Short mmCIF file of C-alpha atoms and ligand atoms in Angstrom, two decimals:
data_model
loop_
_atom_site.label_atom_id
_atom_site.label_comp_id
_atom_site.label_asym_id
_atom_site.label_seq_id
_atom_site.Cartn_x
_atom_site.Cartn_y
_atom_site.Cartn_z
CA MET A 1 -29.93 63.96 -97.87
CA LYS A 2 -28.13 63.59 -94.52
CA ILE A 3 -28.71 61.28 -91.56
CA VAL A 4 -27.01 62.43 -88.35
CA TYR A 5 -26.90 60.02 -85.39
CA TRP A 6 -25.21 59.06 -82.12
CA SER A 7 -24.82 55.37 -81.26
CA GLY A 8 -23.07 53.85 -78.23
CA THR A 9 -23.08 50.16 -79.16
CA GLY A 10 -24.11 50.28 -82.82
CA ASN A 11 -27.87 49.80 -82.53
CA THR A 12 -28.93 53.27 -83.67
CA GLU A 13 -26.04 53.16 -86.17
CA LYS A 14 -27.57 50.06 -87.79
CA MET A 15 -30.97 51.80 -87.93
CA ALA A 16 -29.34 54.76 -89.70
CA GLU A 17 -27.77 52.47 -92.32
CA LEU A 18 -31.08 50.76 -93.06
CA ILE A 19 -32.88 54.11 -93.28
CA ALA A 20 -30.23 55.25 -95.80
CA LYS A 21 -30.77 52.02 -97.74
CA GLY A 22 -34.47 52.91 -98.12
CA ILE A 23 -33.67 56.38 -99.43
CA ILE A 24 -31.15 54.90 -101.88
CA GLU A 25 -33.66 52.26 -103.09
CA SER A 26 -35.96 55.21 -103.80
CA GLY A 27 -33.25 56.56 -106.12
CA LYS A 28 -31.87 59.40 -104.01
CA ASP A 29 -28.44 59.99 -102.51
CA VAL A 30 -27.90 60.08 -98.75
CA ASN A 31 -25.00 60.21 -96.32
CA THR A 32 -24.93 58.92 -92.75
CA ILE A 33 -22.87 61.11 -90.43
CA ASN A 34 -21.92 60.42 -86.82
CA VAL A 35 -22.83 63.48 -84.70
CA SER A 36 -19.15 63.97 -83.82
CA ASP A 37 -18.19 64.56 -87.49
CA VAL A 38 -21.16 66.68 -88.60
CA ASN A 39 -20.74 70.20 -90.06
CA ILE A 40 -23.62 72.33 -88.75
CA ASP A 41 -23.46 74.82 -91.61
CA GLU A 42 -23.77 72.15 -94.30
CA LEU A 43 -26.46 70.35 -92.34
CA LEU A 44 -28.66 73.46 -92.11
CA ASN A 45 -28.87 73.67 -95.91
CA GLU A 46 -30.90 70.44 -95.93
CA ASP A 47 -34.66 70.59 -96.43
CA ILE A 48 -35.15 67.60 -94.11
CA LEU A 49 -33.08 66.82 -91.02
CA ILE A 50 -33.06 63.07 -90.20
CA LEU A 51 -31.85 62.74 -86.57
CA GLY A 52 -31.27 59.67 -84.43
CA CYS A 53 -30.06 58.86 -80.93
CA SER A 54 -30.65 56.01 -78.49
CA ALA A 55 -32.27 56.47 -75.08
CA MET A 56 -29.61 57.49 -72.50
CA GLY A 57 -29.29 58.52 -68.85
CA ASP A 58 -32.83 58.32 -67.54
CA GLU A 59 -34.89 58.75 -70.71
CA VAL A 60 -32.83 61.59 -72.18
CA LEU A 61 -30.74 62.31 -75.31
CA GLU A 62 -27.05 61.36 -75.06
CA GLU A 63 -25.41 64.10 -73.00
CA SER A 64 -21.80 64.65 -74.10
CA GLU A 65 -22.33 64.90 -77.85
CA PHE A 66 -25.90 64.70 -79.14
CA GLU A 67 -27.66 66.99 -76.63
CA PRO A 68 -25.17 69.90 -77.21
CA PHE A 69 -25.64 69.43 -80.97
CA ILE A 70 -29.44 69.77 -80.67
CA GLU A 71 -28.89 72.84 -78.50
CA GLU A 72 -26.60 74.35 -81.10
CA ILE A 73 -29.05 74.01 -84.01
CA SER A 74 -32.26 74.74 -82.00
CA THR A 75 -32.31 78.43 -82.93
CA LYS A 76 -31.76 77.90 -86.67
CA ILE A 77 -34.28 75.16 -87.48
CA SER A 78 -37.69 76.90 -87.27
CA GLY A 79 -39.88 75.71 -90.14
CA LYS A 80 -37.61 72.80 -91.05
CA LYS A 81 -38.92 69.29 -91.61
CA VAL A 82 -37.41 66.68 -89.30
CA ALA A 83 -37.65 62.87 -88.99
CA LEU A 84 -36.60 61.24 -85.71
CA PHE A 85 -35.41 57.72 -84.87
CA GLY A 86 -33.55 55.74 -82.24
CA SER A 87 -33.01 52.48 -80.39
CA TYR A 88 -34.03 51.98 -76.76
CA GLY A 89 -33.74 49.26 -74.16
CA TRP A 90 -35.99 49.04 -71.14
CA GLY A 91 -38.43 51.94 -71.37
CA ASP A 92 -41.34 52.56 -73.74
CA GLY A 93 -40.21 55.61 -75.68
CA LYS A 94 -40.32 58.46 -73.15
CA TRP A 95 -37.05 59.96 -74.43
CA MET A 96 -38.49 60.05 -77.98
CA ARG A 97 -41.87 61.51 -76.95
CA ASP A 98 -39.86 64.28 -75.29
CA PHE A 99 -37.48 64.65 -78.24
CA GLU A 100 -40.47 65.08 -80.59
CA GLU A 101 -42.16 67.64 -78.33
CA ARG A 102 -38.84 69.48 -78.07
CA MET A 103 -38.34 69.68 -81.87
CA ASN A 104 -41.93 70.79 -82.34
CA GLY A 105 -41.36 73.53 -79.76
CA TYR A 106 -38.36 74.79 -81.79
CA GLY A 107 -40.74 75.35 -84.69
CA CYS A 108 -39.88 72.18 -86.62
CA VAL A 109 -42.45 70.12 -88.45
CA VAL A 110 -42.02 66.45 -87.47
CA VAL A 111 -42.94 64.81 -90.79
CA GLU A 112 -43.53 61.26 -89.62
CA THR A 113 -44.11 59.36 -86.41
CA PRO A 114 -40.63 58.82 -84.87
CA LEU A 115 -39.23 55.35 -85.50
CA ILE A 116 -38.16 53.58 -82.31
CA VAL A 117 -36.78 50.01 -82.13
CA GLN A 118 -35.83 47.96 -79.10
CA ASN A 119 -32.14 47.04 -79.02
CA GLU A 120 -30.73 45.87 -82.39
CA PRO A 121 -33.05 46.15 -85.46
CA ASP A 122 -32.97 42.46 -86.56
CA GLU A 123 -36.74 41.83 -86.85
CA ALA A 124 -37.54 45.52 -87.47
CA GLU A 125 -35.03 45.84 -90.37
CA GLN A 126 -37.70 46.36 -93.04
CA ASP A 127 -39.44 48.91 -90.80
CA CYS A 128 -36.21 50.94 -90.89
CA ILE A 129 -35.94 50.68 -94.68
CA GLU A 130 -39.62 51.67 -95.05
CA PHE A 131 -39.19 54.74 -92.78
CA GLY A 132 -36.43 55.83 -95.15
CA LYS A 133 -38.76 55.40 -98.14
CA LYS A 134 -41.40 57.57 -96.43
CA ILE A 135 -38.81 60.29 -95.84
CA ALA A 136 -37.66 60.11 -99.47
CA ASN A 137 -41.26 60.70 -100.58
CA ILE A 138 -41.74 64.03 -98.82
C1 FMN B 1 -26.17 54.53 -69.63
C2 FMN B 1 -27.38 54.07 -70.38
C3 FMN B 1 -28.63 54.58 -70.10
C4 FMN B 1 -29.78 54.13 -70.82
N1 FMN B 1 -31.02 54.71 -70.59
C5 FMN B 1 -32.09 54.20 -71.20
C6 FMN B 1 -33.47 54.67 -70.85
O1 FMN B 1 -33.69 55.57 -70.04
N2 FMN B 1 -34.50 54.02 -71.49
C7 FMN B 1 -34.32 52.94 -72.34
O2 FMN B 1 -35.28 52.40 -72.80
N3 FMN B 1 -33.07 52.51 -72.66
C8 FMN B 1 -32.01 53.08 -72.14
N4 FMN B 1 -30.75 52.59 -72.42
C9 FMN B 1 -30.61 51.47 -73.36
C10 FMN B 1 -30.16 51.90 -74.77
O3 FMN B 1 -31.00 52.94 -75.27
C11 FMN B 1 -30.23 50.71 -75.72
O4 FMN B 1 -29.34 49.69 -75.27
C12 FMN B 1 -29.99 50.99 -77.22
O5 FMN B 1 -30.17 49.79 -77.97
C13 FMN B 1 -28.61 51.60 -77.44
O6 FMN B 1 -28.45 51.94 -78.81
P1 FMN B 1 -27.02 52.36 -79.22
O7 FMN B 1 -26.15 51.20 -79.50
O8 FMN B 1 -27.33 52.98 -80.59
O9 FMN B 1 -26.54 53.37 -78.28
C14 FMN B 1 -29.62 53.10 -71.80
C15 FMN B 1 -28.36 52.59 -72.06
C16 FMN B 1 -27.24 53.07 -71.39
C17 FMN B 1 -25.89 52.52 -71.80
#
């Protein structure tokens, strides 16, 4: 499996690592890839796309790298299962509610409720691991 993410200070990056840990504990292989190093072609071969990005701008996906990436794959992901996650700071999840509605509109099936954590995981560490285990069970 593959986990693709964008992280500005390391918060969403930490979530990605913990999610991968859950998949590994379930006995499956997984690789975490920063959005800047992802190969679209390889990524599209995956049954499940696990995508993460923190809340940026004013409740939007990061603009210089993540947003263009979503735009690029939007036309080739109809019918694909996707799991969404990300860290946020002062809001209550608006960027993720929008992200989910967007993916659903592209024809994707959002397999689980998106996982959102405020700032660094710390207390929500197990929640991240568990989300990974749910994904590994689909
Ligand atoms: C320029 C900028 C804009 C942000 N916009 C939002 C926002 O609209 N809502 C929110 O809850 N957090 C917002 N945040 C806070 C980040 O989402 C939060 O600090 C998160 O933990 C960052 O995770 P990261 O290290 O993975 O990027 C913003 C942060 C920055 C730097």
